[PDB]
Each structure stands twice: as structure tokens, then as C-alpha cells.
Design a protein around this ligand. Structure first.
Ligand SMILES: N#Cc1ccc(CC(=O)NC2(C(=O)O)CCCCC2)cc1C1CC1
Length: 155
């Protein structure tokens, strides 16, 4: 009644550049293709901040409310937990971390995101686990695009 997995992506951009995008707890839509809008109150990037996420139309759900559990600017770890919305996921937490990774003779970034989540009563472990992986890999392919496009424009 619980599945967990880890997804990775090699990114051809400097870690400081990927981190500047990944840490924006208040602007996930900057690269997450299925999120339309995001609102945060208070000091926006501090442990405990809460975001209300509006998803794109035409999806199984529309809203998500998430908390910022970890934001480590020295080690480049961002940890979030989802706590409300009109989706099917219970006790989802995840952690994305960035790591220096030489690619093509130049320095790049290796993005690693692990998640854990309850299996719904009426659903399979394999069926649950797999749907979230595919969404995260999409998020990380798009993260690589956005940061590589930014890196390019630095010339
Ligand atoms: N139904 C559905 C659904 C589809 C895409 C997103 C947007 C998204 O990308 N959501 C994750 C994220 O990394 O923000 C990756 C996938 C696991 C939830 C967190 C969110 C949700 C619901 C809030 C669960």
C-alpha cells in the first residue's frame, strides 16, 4: 500500500543555473508543463511556505496544495509534500536534488527526484508507481529543456 521510485535526468547546464529554477517553490510552472498557475503567501521560499497550484485544464484534477519541507541552498535539495487538492494522491512527498556531473567534457547537472506516496485502496502498486514516474520524467525532460535554452541564451 505504498510505492516509491527515483527518476534522474542529465542536464547540459551549470548547476547554479538549474538550481535557480528548481528552488523557485513559488513558480513551478516555470518548467512543469502540467501546472498553469501557483500562489504563495508569506515569505515565499522558507520551510513551511504553502502553495496553491492550479493545474492545466483537461486533467484528472485541477487543484493541489503543497508544503515546502526542505529547501537547502547549499546542497541544492528541494523537498515538498502535497496535502490537499482534488486529486487521488495521499501522503505524497518528494525530494529533488542537484549534483555536479561532467557531460561532454563540460560541467553539467544531474537532477534526481525521489518520491513516496500511498497506493489508493482501489488501485495497484505497479499502476500507481508508474503513473507518477511518467509525470516526473516529463517534468525533468522539460526542466532540461528550459535550463539548456537559458544556458544557450547566455551567449
Ligand atoms: N492527477 C494529477 C496531476 C497531474 C500533474 C500534476 C502536476 C505535477 O507535475 N505534479 C508532480 C510535481 O512534480 O509537481 C509530479 C507528479 C506527482 C505529483 C507531483 C499534478 C497532479 C495532481 C496533483 C497530483
Amino acid at each position: 500500500s505504498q510505492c516509491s521510485s527515483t527518476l534522474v535526468k542529465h542536464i547540459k547546464a551549470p548547476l547554479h543555473l538549474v538550481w535557480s529554477i528548481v528552488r523557485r517553490f513559488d513558480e513551478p510552472q516555470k518548467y512543469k508543463p502540467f501546472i498553469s498557475r501557483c500562489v504563495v503567501q508569506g515569505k515565499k521560499l522558507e520551510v513551511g511556505s504553502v502553495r496553491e497550484v492550479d493545474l492545466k485544464s483537461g486533467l484528472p484534477a485541477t487543484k493541489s496544495t503543497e508544503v515546502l519541507e526542505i529547501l537547502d541552498d547549499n546542497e541544492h535539495i528541494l523537498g515538498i509534500r502535497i496535502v490537499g487538492g482534488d486529486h487521488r494522491l495521499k501522503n505524497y512527498s518528494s525530494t529533488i536534488s542537484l549534483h555536479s556531473e561532467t557531460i561532454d567534457g563540460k560541467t553539467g547537472t544531474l537532477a534526481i527526484e525521489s518520491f513516496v506516496v500511498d497506493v489508493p485502496e482501489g488501485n495497484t502498486k505497479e499502476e500507481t508507481c508508474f503513473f507518477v514516474e511518467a509525470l516526473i520524467q516529463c517534468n525533468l525532460n522539460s526542466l532540461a529543456d528550459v535550463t539548456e535554452r537559458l544556458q544557450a541564451e547566455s551567449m
